[PDB]
Amino acid sequence: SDKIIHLTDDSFDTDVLKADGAILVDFWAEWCGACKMIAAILDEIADEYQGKLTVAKLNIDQNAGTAAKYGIRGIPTLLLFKNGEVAATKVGALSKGQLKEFLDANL
Ligand SMILES: [Cu+2]
Ligand code: NA
Question: Would you indicate the residue range of the signal peptide?
Fold first, then answer.
């Protein structure tokens, strides 16, 4: 958790939309096994991709407005942002290797 930004409705524009470089945002909530599945995977990816990628989480129960703005329809959903825009979407739990494949394809 040392390299993961916790985003909110109030920080999203500064932390994500105005940020430099690609930002991977995990839309998640409690009572979601698949969300838990990717939590440790995200710490690993944040470390291995440091300097090329920023990793962040947005809890959709705590920040419903932002979840609605990006049309979250299931959790977890990973949105990859570049320059304030959604570059790519990955729905559901996946392995570390699968997440690396998604990132490498879109970076
Ligand atoms: Cu950490
Ligand atoms: Na998908």
Answer: none
State which residues have CB under 5 angstroms from ligand 1, the bound ion: 1-2, 43
- Collapse the DSSP code of 36 into the 3-class scheme (helix H, G, I; strand E, B; otherwise coil) and give the result: helix
The Cα–Cα gap between 8 and 45 comes to 21
- 84 neighbors 18 (Cβ within 8 angstroms): yes
Phi-psi region of 71 (alpha: psi -120 to 50; beta: other; left: phi over 0): left
DSSP-assigned letter for residue 95: -
Answer whether CATH 3.30.1460.10 is correct for domain 1-107. Answer: no
Q: So which residues are the catalytic ones?
A: 32, 35
Resolution in A for the shown PDB structure? 1.4
Please give the method by which this entry was determined: X-ray
